[PDB]
DNA sequence: CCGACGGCGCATCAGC
DNA sequence: GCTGATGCGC
DNA sequence: GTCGG
């Protein structure tokens, strides 16, 4: 449905969204808003009026309240109010620094450090991340077109391979069901010397060929099985070099990895219809493995998994390629 | 009425 | 110094 | 803020 067709009114329920998490820290409120904003940016009719919207699921009495508010006047008071109130605008900016979350953010502002140009002035007040969250403020805020994904893939799975041709890697996310654009890049990795009842080297490896031929340049966090960094394809040698982008990277056992493929593919809209089917299968599935449920509830050991396939062959599901999980 | 609303790895803090 | 909580991101 | 047991 067109942006056009209620588009003032998504966008208003999205910043309040922001403001619920980054200065009032209401999370939950947060993902109301965000629900509520949803539901009605798929709706095929343009609102007229907030009982309309309220027979939506996630759309309430108080948000029907400030649709009636915002059709009639094209606006909303408070929203207005709070849009122009520099401490709270300046706190629910500082939380679009990667790193920054609400209390950061709020800390900053108390202490009268609200723009980039202040973080800029006060590095020694930030840690490792959110420098790093800072000096590529503006690239981590560019989507990712899926033509610089293949080759971001390319590189990826021709290091991975290069460092043991052993290791299975798979890009999820979006990307994955064939998104044209991504906002970053998952990568699964697993070896078959890793299982969940069996090196603390396996990520490492991978981590440091990639740096090693300068793919990965910067690390926000990294452990002995999750990665997170960022990275940037080689510059044309003449071209305008391509910005930086967000990298995770994962090391799942052997036998919970197409759990785990199946899970960061998505979307969630799937994920969450998928566990409801096999729960009314009698199967239990989170992202680690699928579980049988006994007539009493009690979750037995988990099942086998070799493939994705695997785990719809056992909830009576045909295989849904990654570009059919949209739902 | 009133609790659930995602759970967990990693960096860093808070307390001992 | 060790251990648990908290912030943050996903 | 919305849902539902
Ligand atoms: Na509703
Ligand atoms: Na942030
Ligand atoms: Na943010
Ligand atoms: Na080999």
Known sequence: PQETLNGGITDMLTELANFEKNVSQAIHKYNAYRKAASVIAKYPHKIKSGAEAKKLPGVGTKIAEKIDEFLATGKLRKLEKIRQDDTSSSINFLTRVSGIGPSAARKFVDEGIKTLEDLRKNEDKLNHHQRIGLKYFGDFEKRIPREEMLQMQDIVLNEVKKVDSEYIATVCGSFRRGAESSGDMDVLLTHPSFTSES?????????????????????????????????????????????????????????????????????????????????????????????????????????????????????????????????
């Open 199 to 327: 090196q603390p080297k396996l990520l490492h490896q991978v981590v440091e060929q990639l740096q090693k031929v300068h793919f990965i340049t910067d690390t926000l966090s990294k452990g002995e099985t999750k990665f997170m960094g960022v990275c940037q394809l080689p510059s044309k040698n003449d071209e305008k070099e391509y910005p930086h982008r967000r990298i995770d990277i994962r090391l799942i056992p052997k036998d919970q990895y197409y759990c785990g493929v199946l899970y960061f593919t998505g979307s969630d809209i799937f994920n969450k219809n998928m566990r409801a089917h096999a729960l009314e299968k009698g199967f239990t599935i989170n992202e680690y493995t699928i579980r049988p449920l006994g007539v009493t509830g009690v979750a037995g050991e988990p099942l086998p998994v070799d493939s994705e396939k695997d785990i719809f062959d056992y909830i009576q599901w045909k295989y849904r390629e990654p570009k059919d999980r949209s739902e």
